[PDB]
């Protein structure tokens, strides 16, 4: 695998979004991975619907939190609409998939990256964007304005984001807190520290969609 990967440069990453006050990180994270795998397989970059996952994944808890793996399982079984057909409202409402017509895209499955293994995560990122979790509760993470982030932070993961690249000393993450946070909405988190949990617990629970 290469020394530097940035899926933004390959045209596989859409603009940065803002989840607002709703605890819908899990849905945003999952959608970044769908947007990426569809571009990689078909050549087209489209935006897909976070709102539909919020409304329709009844295993998750809407704006009170959820699970990227369940959102990805839902897309493998049912499918997902375009963001413009089912736009983000920031509040959970009723599942409107059927009234909005045929799904726009569908995946074939979900896979978990081996946990607590930096190399396994880099290999996955080299193939496509990946859904990852980290601890975002600490003030240092919240006030991050740029640079390679080393903490402080513990490993009490509470926020789902997406890994879209890496370099020699960092992993590149797309967050869903708008373009004014971090590096135009992104954060570079240090890698290679030998902490098996990863900085801020980054290697705890990572998933990606499968599409043939």
UniProtKB/Swiss-Prot annotation:
It comes from Carica papaya (Papaya). Keywords: Allergen, Disulfide bond, Hydrolase, Protease, Signal, Thiol protease, Zymogen. The active site is at 25, 159, 175. This is Papain. E64 binds at residue 25. Optimum pH is 4. Optimum temperature is 50 degrees Celsius. Unstable upon 65 degrees Celsius. Leupeptin binds at residue 25. It catalyses: Hydrolysis of proteins with broad specificity for peptide bonds, but preference for an amino acid bearing a large hydrophobic side chain at the P2 position. Does not accept Val in P1'. One of its GO terms (biological process) is proteolysis. GO terms for molecular function: cysteine-type peptidase activity; serpin family protein binding. Repressed by the active-site-directed cysteine protease inhibitor E64 (L-trans-epoxysuccinyl-leucylamide-(4-guanido)-butane) produced by Aspergillus japonicus. Inhibited by the inhibitor of cysteine proteases from Trypanosoma brucei (TbICP, rhodesain) and Colocasia esculenta cv. Kaohsiung no. 1 (CeCPI, tarocystatin). Repressed by leupeptin, a peptidic cysteine, serine and threonine protease inhibitor. Disulfide bonds join 22-63, 56-95, 153-200. Changing residue 32 to S: Slightly enhanced thermostability and higher optimum temperature. Enhanced thermostability and higher optimum temperature. The chain holds residues 134 to 345 of 345 of the full protein.
């Amino acid at each position: 695998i290469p020394e530097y990967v940035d899926w933004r440069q390959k045209g596989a990453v859409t603009p940065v979004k803002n989840q607002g006050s709703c605890g819908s990180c899990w849905a945003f994270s999952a959608v970044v991975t769908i947007e990426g795998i569809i571009k990689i397989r078909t050549g087209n970059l489209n935006e897909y619907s976070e709102q539909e996952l919020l409304d329709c994944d009844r295993r998750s808890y809407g704006c009170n939190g959820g699970y990227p793996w369940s959102a990805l399982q839902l897309v493998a079984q049912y499918g997902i609409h375009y963001r413009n057909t089912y736009p983000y409202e920031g509040v959970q409402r009723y599942c409107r998939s059927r009234e909005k017509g045929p799904y726009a895209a569908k995946t074939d499955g979900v896979r978990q990256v081996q946990p607590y293994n930096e190399g396994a995560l880099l290999y996955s990122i080299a193939n496509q964007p990946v859904s990852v979790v980290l601890e975002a509760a600490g003030k240092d993470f919240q006030l991050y304005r740029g640079g390679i982030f080393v903490g402080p932070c513990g490993n009490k993961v509470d926020h789902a984001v997406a890994a879209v690249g890496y370099g020699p000393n960092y992993i590149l993450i797309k967050n869903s807190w708008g373009t004014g946070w971090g590096e135009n909405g992104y954060i570079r988190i240090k890698r290679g520290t030998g902490n098996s949990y990863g900085v801020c617990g980054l290697y705890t629970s990572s998933f990606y969609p499968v599409k043939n």
